[PDB]
Amino acid sequence: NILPVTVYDQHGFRILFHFARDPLPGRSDVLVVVVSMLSTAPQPIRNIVFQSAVPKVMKVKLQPPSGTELPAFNPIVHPSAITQVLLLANPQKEKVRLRYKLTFTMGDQTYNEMGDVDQFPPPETWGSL
């Protein structure tokens, strides 16, 4: 599942997961996930909180995001992008399932979103970067 997975796509707010692994070269237990976010929306999106959960055999860890908001889309310029790292410990090499909780505000509404991600690269190939 090497290619970038779209975790979220509504109201023109997209969140993708990008896959990698570290840090002992030797090991194949921790997956690095860079989660990138772009907006195409006409009104800006602010107060972004992305949470994640995993099954009891695994462990997830969310580093602070590069930011918390995105401007109204201005197609003329380079788009703004939020980027966040998350680390997924799974030494038992069990099946990979993740459940996110997305929170953001756009105009006067506040979206409280939840979804499942299952398209992870199989734990075997985590050593191979």
Binding site: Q51, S52, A53, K56
Partner: peptide
């Protein structure tokens, strides 16, 4: 099942 959700 699974653990609780995790924040930043």
């Amino acid at each position: 099942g699974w653990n609780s959700f995790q924040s930043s």
